[PDB]
């Protein structure tokens, strides 16, 4: 129910970085992602979906990258 830190984390990384490869962010996020506890690569993925749907991220053409929208 609290995958929320995760969404918070992604946008923090995506705002500063502005464009990453899926794997990079999915792990780079996990890096400074644990620390409050371990999170399965499943979980970080659902966050991306949540942000993709909210309007924060736009998936790159190739299908394996994310871009931070306005």
């Amino acid at each position: 129910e609290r995958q929320i830190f995760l969404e918070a984390c992604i946008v923090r990384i995506m705002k500063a970085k502005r464009n990453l490869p899926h794997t990079t962010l999915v792990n780079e996020c996990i890096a400074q992602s644990h620390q409050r506890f371990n999170a399965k690569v499943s979980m970080v993925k659902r966050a991306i979906d949540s942000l993709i749907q909210k309007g924060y991220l736009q998936r790159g053409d190739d299908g394996e990258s994310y871009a931070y929208l306005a």
Partner: protein, 195 residues
């Protein structure tokens, strides 16, 4: 071209080329509104959303661009598009993606699974450019209706194409599908659904 402005003037209702006039027009050409060819036609005339009116200047402009002046010419044109949809993977993809917004309700951000499946049944037919075992497509539908997924998002939609392109067999999935990848979570649930 007088014929063009004559045709457009034939299917008009209350001074408009609305949805009911498009229906009466494609049917004369030999099709149905639900067909992939209509997606092709819609895309050519540059529709943005299906029920939205078509401007004269728009109709007269596209038809002349091609080199049609008769119904017989128009009918001929679409048939080429429909065929291109079966032979050119670029066009197939380009139209697959274009379909979502057209099917999509402006009073919404997703389409209902009901409406999506309809178009999937046509898009992923054995005959078409993205060849796949009919058993898989049946799988995906079974999963969609069981796990109670009622709506599908543009992302999922544009991603399922890339997915079926890599995996044509329930077999090849269980084999190497890698759940640590960009495939939307929804696909993973499907992947976990296999067994």
């Amino acid at each position: 071209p007088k014929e063009l402005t004559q045709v457009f003037e034939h299917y008009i209702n209350n001074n408009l080329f609305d949805i009911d006039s498009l229906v009466k027009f494609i049917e004369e050409l030999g099709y149905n509104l639900e067909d992939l060819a209509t997606l092709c036609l819609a895309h050519l005339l540059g529709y943005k959303k299906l029920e939205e009116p078509l401007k004269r200047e728009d109709f007269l402009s596209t038809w002349f661009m091609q080199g049609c002046s008769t119904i017989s010419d128009m009918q001929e044109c679409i048939k080429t598009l429909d065929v291109k949809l079966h032979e050119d993977l670029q066009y197939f993809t380009q139209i697959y993606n274009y379909a979502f917004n057209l099917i999509l309700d402006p009073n919404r951000k997703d389409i209902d699974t009901d409406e999506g499946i309809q178009y999937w049944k046509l898009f992923f037919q054995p005959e078409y450019p993205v060849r796949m075992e009919p058993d898989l497509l049946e799988a995906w539908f079974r999963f969609l209706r069981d796990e109670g997924k009622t709506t599908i998002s543009k992302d999922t939609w544009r991603m399922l194409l890339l997915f079926f392109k890599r995996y044509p067999t329930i077999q090849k999935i269980i084999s190497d599908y890698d759940e640590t990848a960009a495939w939307p979570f929804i696909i993973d649930e499907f992947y976990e659904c296999l067994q």
